[PDB]
Design a protein around this ligand. Structure first.
Ligand code: CA
Ligand code: CA
Ligand code: CA
Ligand code: CA
Ligand code: CL
Ligand code: CL
Ligand code: CL
Ligand code: CL
Lengths: 181, 181, 181, 181
């Protein structure tokens, strides 16, 4: 029950131990929620390298990683390519559609899935999964619903915190390896 | 009186109950006040997806949304397109003009209007509306003048907080649906 | 001695009363110190509209505004054009050179000048002026040398805070007009 | 043992006195860890001018500066050119390679090297050097391993803090000269 971010319940650790697939929202989870827009139609989004390391650890220690996001941008495809994420659903605000598709294709039971969200749109999927996670600065109405609330804010390493938790629960943390990219 | 951001007064809830139009400043309200400028004349501004969700909820819950801003940029037109906002006034440093235009165009009384601002230039309109709001980190001189002061800072979900308040006051918060974009 | 940011000394108010010229550093004063750089050689810098409003008030209330910075970028020329700043010195790491030119050009005594800095490179000039200001989050070694330390951090409205102070000290605050740009 | 960021140990100051080479990570040390990505494959990273000043002081006070990073970007080359850094290793998955090359090329012993990191990938090099530094907001598992934990966060002047410490320890702080760029 001890972790480098502080104590976790036995129940959260047991849920984390079973995790075969980690699903992430983007905006407000992998980022602090900001969308950068320019006069020539440019768009930027900011990701955190500390999360990149966690995702690389997950992917090289037998935990699959997927993304389901309401927005759609080529930059997100590029981020996934950097990190080796091969399951990406964009443009999807009815996330249960993507959820159903993903689990059918991978043959994974919902109880072996974790989901990290930050807003109410995430809840229908979070309700179904083995380990639901809200980031520290998630919408107030989402926070009390999740199995685990991260210590770290969205875009600041909430995703690394979840990666670290899964790895720890599975006895993979000490020997995990990643790239901080 | 209890909200997910903390208690509010009966007077504020009563004001919020009657709101048919939400008017928003941009810089310092929908953003944290920063203007990104480049050597080739590029310009960026950052918006928050959490505010996007609130605006989508409002617009699909019979609450119109308008924007009045002192600056002018194509990127702001683009953001409004994303969110389905059809009332945008840019390059406006006498805000009473756009305000009067909206009252006429939407056949609406000032008491049915809310305004979210962050600086002194917003007060002439805020003075007239049914629910005036200053964001948590508005200019110190503006804060004591508003009906309601948000808990959340400009660009970090102050607008969502206001959307949430209107929907709650109007008994629409539970069934409200949007896209976090 | 009261201000909207907190009490100030009689001595600081008296110094502020006499200011005919406001000199500002850029990086860490008008911004939070960040330089955005891209792979195509793009460069961005972020300014705060809250400071834009203060600068506009100063300029239209018989207080000249000048900028002395160690870096050089076209975007800074563009920012100055937005705000109507006509006294700009870039690529200047010996700031006394630019300081001397300014005083000579404008025929103004040092005691009638305020300077807002955030690092040790600003001290030679700050040492000579009537009102030296360090931003709240200036380098620790600079802070104790300044006449006034702002409550607000660089890039977050420290410059607005100084503009407000000068205008208050000179009985111009209530009637000052600017644009939030 | 007093510093402008607070007291340090006799041991840390003695280690700092012997430093002839300062090695820095980029993401999360020279920046706050964020990677900005756009739809046309643009990339931005943000550096802090306060760090630039410290690096300029180090380089002109007989302290070499090198950078070892896991990512690779032309913008980092450009940043190094601005600051006069001539020792840069990018795309480095095993940071010990660059470290060995540096000891070789510069004919310096590991006890005369400082290293500033923020994540677990930095530890293999940090383990070997004379002064290991973790930034204030480094990964929680790195923090207790370092000789010195900075007060300032990555991207906010943690590097400046380390530059100031080395200069102070070597009796070079008072007379050090730089450019805040
Ligand atoms: Ca989200
Ligand atoms: Ca504003
Ligand atoms: Ca500066
Ligand atoms: Ca790093
Ligand atoms: Cl979403
Ligand atoms: Cl405005
Ligand atoms: Cl400078
Ligand atoms: Cl790295």
């Amino acid at each position: 029950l001890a972790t480098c971010y502080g104590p976790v319940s036995a129940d959260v650790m047991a849920k984390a131990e079973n995790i075969r697939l980690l699903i992430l929202d983007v905006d407000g989870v992998l980022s602090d929620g900001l969308i950068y827009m320019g006069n020539n139609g440019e768009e930027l989004k900011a990701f955190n390298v500390r999360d990149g390391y966690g995702i690389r650890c997950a992917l090289t220690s037998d935990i699959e990683v997927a993304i389901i996001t309401g927005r759609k941008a080529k930059l997100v495809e590029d981020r996934c390519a950097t990190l080796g994420i091969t399951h990406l659903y964009q443009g999807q605000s009815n996330k249960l559609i993507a959820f159903s598709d993903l689990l059918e294709k991978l043959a994974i039971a919902p109880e072996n899935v974790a989901y990290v969200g930050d807003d109410l749109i995430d809840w229908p999927v979070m309700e179904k999964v083995g380990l639901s996670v809200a980031v520290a600065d998630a919408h107030p109405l989402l926070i009390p619903r999740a199995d685990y609330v991260t210590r770290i804010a969205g875009g600041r390493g909430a995703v690394r915190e979840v990666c670290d938790l899964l790895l720890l629960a599975q006895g993979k943390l000490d020997e995990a390896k990643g790239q901080s990219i």
